[PDB]
Amino acid sequence: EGRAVLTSKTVKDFMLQKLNSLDIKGNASKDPAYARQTCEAILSAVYSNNKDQCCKLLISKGVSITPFLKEIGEAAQNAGLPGEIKNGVFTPGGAGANPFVVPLIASASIKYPHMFINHNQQVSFKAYAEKIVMKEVTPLFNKGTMPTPQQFQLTIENIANKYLQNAS
Structure with missing residues (x-):
């Protein structure tokens, strides 16, 4: 959008544009x-x-996202995107x-200084x-036989959300 207020979805809008x-x-079609x-x-x-969203609050409890990373890496392994591995992770x-x-987000950080001014706004953006x-x-x-972002994100979020809660 292009208004002098926008609100609700400004970047969200320009981010969507x-x-x-x-x-x-x-x-992905022109570039294999x-x-x-x-x-x-x-x-x-x-x-x-x-691993960013779950570890974000997890790094506050002092937990261990590696085991959770191991789980999204499962989906990340089963989804067809491999690249790193360590102690059973x-x-x-x-x-x-x-x-x-x-x-x-870099565009909106460059474009929307107003909305990205707060250190906790561009990360949530x-x-x-x-x-x-x-x-x-x-x-x-x-x-192909790849999972959708929502089916995979939920199954992933489900491990972020599983590690998310953890008593508190």
Whole structure:
């Protein structure tokens, strides 16, 4: 959108416009490499967001997300995105901070200084930013046997949410 107030969904909107114009699938369709980095890294993004979102509150309890990372790495292994592994733990190749949300949020961090001013706002910004690409990435999971972002995210979130609670 382009208003002097926007509210409710401003970046969310420009993030969605970027998301739409990011055509995570069109590039996965024109770029067979892009698809490799956008099909495995999308669910590895949720994987990583899981390790980011779950570990975010978990690092506050002083827990251990590695075992949970091991679980999203399962989904990340079973989903077809491998790359890291250690003491009975594994992680998907592109287990960074999301290849689409990074610049998607980087754009909004560059674009929306107002909404990204608070250190705890751009981190949460990428949280619903990963939820939108699931509409763009979903279709890359249709041309094969890959899980959807929502089916995989829920199964992942389910381990973030499982580690999330933990008494408190």
